[PDB]
């Protein structure tokens, strides 16, 4: 099998497109999948040096972060639950001051390995504030390449057919980080792809588990949190669960890590579990997207069952348009298709 030979270790791959390769987003995503990048659950794409989404970020000090969250973390021994305390609205200027203040700034460190140890040692102390989930873009209007606010993928069929906007999913979110702000282990809503561009500032570090091993992570998590498992069918979707790399190693869960620098894109793939943290004051922009290969994942995504506010996209339009043979079978509950996580298209 040809797909199984490509990226056989399911390691996170990094790509450096030329400007010509970079122009067609859906085409380039298809290309990186032809190289087996999706097997990692995460890939880095470094755009051409001549490409820029914005002239300068010197005009954003007055941008409002309406719902900053203070991240209270509880736990020990590589297993943590993160609780989100919402604080009052603040401006980017008010946030950056806090971020760089003696109290909240990045500790001194030699190599990333040292900073990673400090993260895992200190994450339950000095709860940081994350300027997360801010509706908006920092891309200039004319930018046609990899524009997070208009990628033109088949995810556009949701709004097209129903008028439905789902904030952060088919619209962009901004994330202003400071040292030790975290994103818990999760896959995307409806097991979609995501794109994450780090506009400026200190790095954002990522952990990823191959989609091929996602079920093994779930089994571990359900074992570490039996109470949460009984309460909800997909408790990781609460995005509250933090698990250290040492804990993953101890239980033989394959994973990889990568550090995203300012100017770089991360792509997450359907059913690719990821988690991470910010190094210091930074700003990221992200949204979800889809490809034809997502459709089966969307059909089989296991959704949070204890909240009537979680994200649920109707699959009907995608199955009708892109799987006409199987529509009647699926509607009658008899579509037993098995996902091969290695395969492209």
């Amino acid at each position: 099998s040809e797909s199984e030979t490509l990226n056989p270790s399911a390691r996170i791959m990094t790509f450096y497109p030329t400007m010509e390769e970079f122009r067609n987003f859906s085409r380039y995503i298809a290309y990186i999948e032809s190289q087996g990048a999706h097997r990692a659950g995460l890939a880095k794409v470094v755009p051409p040096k001549e490409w820029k989404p914005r002239a300068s970020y010197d005009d954003i000090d007055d941008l409002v972060i309406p719902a900053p969250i203070q991240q209270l973390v509880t736990g020990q021994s590589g297993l943590f639950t993160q609780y989100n305390i919402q604080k009052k609205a603040m401006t980017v200027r008010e946030f950056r001051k806090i971020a760089n203040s003696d109290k909240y700034c990045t500790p001194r460190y030699s190599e990333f390995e040292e900073l990673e140890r400090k993260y895992w040692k200190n994450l339950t102390f000095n709860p940081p504030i994350y300027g997360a989930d801010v509706n908006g873009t920092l891309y200039e209007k004319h930018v046609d390449e990899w524009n997070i606010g208009r990628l033109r993928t088949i995810l556009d069929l949701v709004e097209k057919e129903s008028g439905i906007t789902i904030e952060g999913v088919n619209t962009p979110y901004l994330y202003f980080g400071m040292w030790k702000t975290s994103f818990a282990w999760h896959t995307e809503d409806m097991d979609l792809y995501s794109i994450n561009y780090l506009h400026f500032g200190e790095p954002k570090s990522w952990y990823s588990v191959p989609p091929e091993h996602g079920k093994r992570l779930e089994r571990l998590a359900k074992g570490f949190f039996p109470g949460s498992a009984q309460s909800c069918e997909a408790f990781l979707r609460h995005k509250m669960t933090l698990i250290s790399p040492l804990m993953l190693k101890k239980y033989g869960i394959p994973f990889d890590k990568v550090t995203q620098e300012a100017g770089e894109f991360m792509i997450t793939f359907p059913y690719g579990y990821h988690a991470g943290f910010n190094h210091g004051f930074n700003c990221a922009e992200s949204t979800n997207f889809a490809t034809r290969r997502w459709i089966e994942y969307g059909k089989q995504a296991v959704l949070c069952s204890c909240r009537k506010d979680m994200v649920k996209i109707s699959m009907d339009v995608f199955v009708r348009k892109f799987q006409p043979e199987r529509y009647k079978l699926w509607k009658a509950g008899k579509d037993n298709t098995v996902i091969d996580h290695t395969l492209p298209t």
């Binding site: 904030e167 952060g168 999913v169 979110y173 995005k239 979680m310 994200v311």
Partner: peptide, 4 residues
């Protein structure tokens, strides 16, 4: 409804 929205991503969080």
């Amino acid at each position: 409804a929205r991503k969080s």
